[PDB]
């Protein structure tokens, strides 16, 4: 308690000693509340004008246009501690899982040099701006690294001063850039060294890319077993128990020297005890604390979510196979049985899953899994939009399963070769490309973001008639040599000035392990579309009058955007499609 958090709290109180007070009408029940001080301040969504001018039919589609307008009453909730039988299953499974992930990997510290390179190439690290302006600036100063050096030696002493969360179905907890360095130094290896790649973790998909997820779901479908289950959890981050945080900390058992101590300190001082500043309009700054729930950097959060999800789903599979009978207490021979299951079939049962953070697909041995709910509910991983004791509804067709906000189609090329392609409702794809994050964007920067969306559509969504046409239009409207950009950077093969047909061939043919015949595709016309009815089912405007006018008059929209940007070198990509090829 206050021995671990006091120092952080005391230090803040003293920077606002002119403002402190224990407000008696604080809303917190489940958070520990400490005090309050004086502040005043808030980045809403802006429209990308290049993308919107080239998608005019969508100006009248509420699903597109509403996306651009506009539970912190779930962050204030508590989870009960699991039963003793549940706690035993989780500790045995976690122990075994860290050993498996470790067999072919070596834990290691990430470097100033690696972190400095991350900020300089614009990753979304989720830090606060104060003493320096940007993230770039503070990285190029030595005073910073003294603050870092100071906090670091405090961590080795088992103490914390400056590692505080700032709060803001999402809630991003920004930390100061220094606190993010020390997290990245201790636990960056999980992401940097691909601990959750498919090859290493068997259930994981870290770094696989959207062009491989469909093929991975089809490979899971090839296994003998029951339906495919894809239950979402209601607010996963809010349901992470202190027992979860302690089984995650067992990765430190594979570490040594300084690393082991630095990683134990992140787990002990920042994760298993947390200090958070919240704004309350009633504008005060509330200093609250608690022990449980997820608050890490977004990237370490991904890896630990994947780990704990993999653990939860193996246990649900154990329950369906009848490996154990009660969660109240594990007998001694029930333990031996669980350990024996893990050693005997654990790796085969991991290969039956696809897991991305809080998101999962499981093809269990059979449909007993559907009603195996006691361990899952008792671990606090309660399923979204279904009654707590109602059996899961599984999918019988891999092409209908949802995963990472997508579904996957089987698409046969004119030469008989088989693509497995990602897809989602086209309104969602167009509404997102029409949004820019943050203010102060030049026309040039707005255009380069449009071009990033266009190249992603050509690579991932080429099979949607409206997106191949809009992607060609945007790339015709933006100067040919201008480089695609993004402010919060899966694998991103569309982020290049290389020719998109050359990239398409590399991604879908050359480097695609499910394609035996490596014959290159010579033109965009060899590359197929979904059937027209399927394209409509997934939101195409093909067949509407608005869409026909747009398509027919596309050169006029392209010319409007070229005139705004000015006298630059442009390419006409529209003749890459049959209907504009004269």
Nearer to Zn ion, 399 or 480 (CB): 399
Using the CB atoms, write b or e for 94-132: b if 16+ within 10 Å. Answer: bebbbebbeeebebebbeeeebeebbeeeeebbbeeeee
Question: Which range of residues in 207-215, 347-355, 485-493, 535-543 is near Zn ion by CB under 5 A?
Answer: 535-543
Q: Given CA atoms 301, 306, 307, 309 in this order, what sign does their dihedral have?
A: positive
The neighbour count for residue 457, using CB atoms within 10 Å, is: 25
Nearer to Zn ion, 214 or 484 (CB): 214
Cross-strand pairs, 286: 278
Q: Does 314 engage in binding with Zn ion (CB under 5 A)? A: no
Q: Does 135 engage in binding with Zn ion (CB under 5 A)? A: no
| Nearest-approach distance from CB 363 to Zn ion, in angstroms | 21
Question: Which range of residues in 144-152, 285-293, 344-352, 559-567 is near Zn ion by CB under 5 A?
Answer: 144-152
The neighbour count for residue 554, using CB atoms within 10 Å, is: 21
Residues in contact with Zn ion, shown as a per-residue x/- string from 510 to 529 under the rule CB under 5 A: --------------------
- Tokens describing residue 233: 């959890």
Q: What is the dihedral of CA 319, 242, 252, 156, to 10 degrees?
A: 180
Select from 187, 342, 355, 423 the one that contacts Zn ion (CB under 5 A): 423
Q: What is the distance, to the nearest Å, from the Cα of residue 506 to the centroid of all Cα atoms in its chain?
A: 25
Terminus-to-terminus CA distance in the chain, angstroms? 74
Q: What is the distance, to the nearest Å, from the Cα of residue 173 to the centroid of all Cα atoms in its chain?
A: 15
| Nearest-approach distance from CB 258 to Zn ion, in angstroms | 15
Residue 299, CB half-sphere, CA atoms under 13 Å: how many? 26
| Nearest-approach distance from CB 490 to Zn ion, in angstroms | 18
- Tokens describing residue 28: 């917190």
| Nearest-approach distance from CB 183 to Zn ion, in angstroms | 9
Q: Does 538 engage in binding with Zn ion (CB under 5 A)? A: yes
Cite the annotated binding site for Zn(2+) by residue number. Answer: 151, 155, 160, 163, 407, 409, 423, 538
Cite the annotated binding site for Mg(2+) by residue number. Answer: 232-233, 358-359
Cite the annotated binding site by residue number. Answer: 151, 155, 160, 163, 170, 232-233, 235-237, 305, 358-359, 384, 407, 409, 423, 538
Q: Given CA atoms 298, 303, 306, 311 in this order, what sign does their dihedral have?
A: negative
| Nearest-approach distance from CB 163 to Zn ion, in angstroms | 3
Nearer to Zn ion, 201 or 301 (CB): 301
Question: Which range of residues in 150-158, 183-191, 328-336, 566-574 is near Zn ion by CB under 5 A?
Answer: 150-158
Q: Does 94 engage in binding with Zn ion (CB under 5 A)? A: no
Nearer to Zn ion, 321 or 428 (CB): 428
Q: What are phi and psi of 26, to 5 degrees?
A: -95, 140
Nearer to Zn ion, 119 or 538 (CB): 538
- According to DSSP H, which parts of 387-499 are helical? 426-433, 443-460, 465-477
Nearer to Zn ion, 345 or 542 (CB): 542
Question: Which range of residues in 248-256, 416-424, 548-556, 559-567 is near Zn ion by CB under 5 A?
Answer: 416-424
| Nearest-approach distance from CB 335 to Zn ion, in angstroms | 37
Which residues are CB-neighbours of 200 under 8 A, at least 6 positions away? 101, 104, 105, 194
The neighbour count for residue 377, using CB atoms within 10 Å, is: 15
Q: What is the dihedral of CA 265, 266, 267, 272, to 10 degrees?
A: 100
Nearer to Zn ion, 135 or 265 (CB): 265
Nearer to Zn ion, 165 or 441 (CB): 165
The neighbour count for residue 55, using CB atoms within 10 Å, is: 24
Nearer to Zn ion, 162 or 247 (CB): 162
The neighbour count for residue 472, using CB atoms within 10 Å, is: 25
**What is the per-residue DSSP string for 323-379?**
S-S-SS---HHHHHHHHHHHHHHHHHHHTTEEEETTEEEE--SSGGGGG--HHHHHT
The H-or-E segment that residue 398 falls in is none
Question: Which range of residues in 44-52, 125-133, 152-160, 370-378 is near Zn ion by CB under 5 A?
Answer: 152-160
Q: Does 160 engage in binding with Zn ion (CB under 5 A)? A: yes
CA distance linking residue 541 with residue 390, whole number of Å: 38
Nearer to Zn ion, 243 or 466 (CB): 466
Nearer to Zn ion, 94 or 541 (CB): 541
- Tokens describing residue 157: 């002493």
| Nearest-approach distance from CB 409 to Zn ion, in angstroms | 6
Question: Which range of residues in 79-87, 137-145, 397-405, 532-540 is near Zn ion by CB under 5 A?
Answer: 532-540
| Nearest-approach distance from CB 144 to Zn ion, in angstroms | 15
Q: Does 163 engage in binding with Zn ion (CB under 5 A)? A: yes
SS3 assignment, position 538: coil
| Nearest-approach distance from CB 214 to Zn ion, in angstroms | 11
Cite the annotated binding site for CTP by residue number. Answer: 170, 235-237, 305, 384
Applying CB under 5 A, the site for Zn ion has a residue count of 5
Rg value, the chain, Cα: 26
Give helix 298-320 / helix 177-187 axis angle, nearest 10°.
Answer: 40
What 8-state DSSP symbol labels residue 195? T
Q: Does 420 engage in binding with Zn ion (CB under 5 A)? A: no
Q: What is the dihedral of CA 241, 246, 249, 250, to 10 degrees?
A: -130
| Nearest-approach distance from CB 160 to Zn ion, in angstroms | 3
Question: Which range of residues in 21-29, 110-118, 148-156, 290-298 is near Zn ion by CB under 5 A?
Answer: 148-156
Residues in contact with Zn ion, shown as a per-residue x/- string from 369 to 408 under the rule CB under 5 A: ----------------------------------------
| Nearest-approach distance from CB 535 to Zn ion, in angstroms | 8
Nearer to Zn ion, 151 or 286 (CB): 151
CA distance linking residue 529 with residue 523, whole number of Å: 14
Q: Does 101 engage in binding with Zn ion (CB under 5 A)? A: no
| Nearest-approach distance from CB 307 to Zn ion, in angstroms | 23
Report the interface residues with Zn ion, using CB under 5 A.
151, 160, 163, 423, 538
């Amino acid at each position: 308690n206050l021995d671990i958090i006091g120092k952080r709290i005391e230090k803040i109180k003293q920077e606002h000693e002119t403002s402190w007070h224990y407000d008696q009408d604080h809303p917190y029940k489940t958070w520990a509340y400490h005090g309050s001080y004086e502040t005043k301040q808030t980045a809403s969504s802006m429209v990308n004008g290049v993308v919107r001018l080239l998608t005019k039919p969508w100006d009248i589609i509420p699903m597109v246009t509403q996306m651009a307008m506009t539970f912190k009453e779930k962050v204030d909730t508590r989870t009960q501690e699991p039963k003793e039988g549940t706690k035993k299953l989780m500790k045995i499974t976690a122990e075994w899982l860290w050993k498996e992930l470790g067999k072919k990997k070596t834990p290691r510290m990430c470097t100033r040099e690696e972190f400095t390179r991350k900020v300089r190439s614009n990753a979304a690290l989720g830090a606060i701006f104060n003493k320096w302006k940007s993230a770039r600036e503070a990285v190029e100063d030595s005073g910073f690294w003294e603050l870092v050096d100071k906090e670091r030696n405090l961590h080795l002493e088992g103490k914390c001063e400056t590692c505080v969360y700032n709060m803001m179905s999402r809630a991003i907890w920004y930390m100061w850039l220094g606190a993010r360095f020390l997290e990245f130094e201790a636990l960056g290896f999980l992401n940097e060294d691909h601990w959750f790649s498919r090859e290493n973790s068997l259930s994981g998909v870290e770094g696989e890319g959207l062009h491989k997820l469909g093929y991975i779901l089809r490979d899971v479908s090839k296994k003998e077993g029951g339906a495919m289950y894809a239950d979402d959890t209601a607010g996963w981050d809010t349901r992470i128990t202190l027992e979860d945080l302690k089984n995650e900390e067992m990765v430190t058992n594979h570490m040594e020297g300084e690393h082991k101590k630095l990683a134990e300190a992140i787990f002990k001082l920042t994760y298993q005890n947390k200090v958070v500043r919240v704004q309350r309009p009633t504008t005060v700054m509330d200093i609250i604390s608690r022990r449980d729930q997820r608050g890490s950097g977004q990237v370490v959060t991904y890896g630990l979510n994947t780990f704990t999800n993999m653990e939860a789903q193996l246990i649900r599979q154990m329950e369906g196979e009848g490996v154990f009978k009660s969660i109240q207490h594990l007998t001694v021979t029930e333990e031996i049985a669980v350990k024996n299951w893990l050693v005997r079939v654990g790796r085969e049962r991991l290969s039956r899953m696809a897991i991305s953070g809080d998101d999962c697909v499981v093809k269990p041995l059979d449909d007993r899994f559907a009603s195996a709910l006691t361990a899952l509910n008792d671990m606090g991983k309660v399923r979204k939009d279904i009654q707590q004791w109602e059996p899961s509804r599984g999918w019988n067709d891999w092409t209908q399963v949802p995963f990472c906000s997508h579904h996957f189609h089987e698409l046969i090329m004119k030469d008989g070769r088989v693509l497995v392609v990602p897809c989602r409702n086209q309104d969602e794809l167009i509404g997102r490309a029409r949004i820019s994050q943050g203010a102060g964007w030049s026309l040039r920067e707005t255009a380069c973001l449009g071009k990033s969306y266009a190249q992603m559509w050509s690579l991932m969504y080429f099979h949607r008639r409206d997106l191949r046409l809009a992607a060609n239009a945007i790339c015709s409207a933006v100067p040919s040599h201008w480089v695609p950009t993004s402010r919060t950077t899966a694998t991103h093969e569309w982020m290049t000035t290389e020719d998109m047909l050359t990239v398409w061939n590399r991604v879908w043919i050359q480097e695609n392990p499910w394609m035996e015949d490596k014959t290159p595709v010579e033109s965009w016309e060899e590359i197929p579309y979904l059937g027209k009815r399927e394209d409509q089912w997934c939101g195409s405007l093909i067949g509407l009058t608005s869409r026909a006018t747009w398509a027919k008059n596309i050169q006029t929209a392209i010319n409007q955007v070229r005139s705004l940007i000015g006298n630059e070198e442009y390419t006409d990509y529209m003749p890459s499609m049959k209907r504009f090829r004269r």
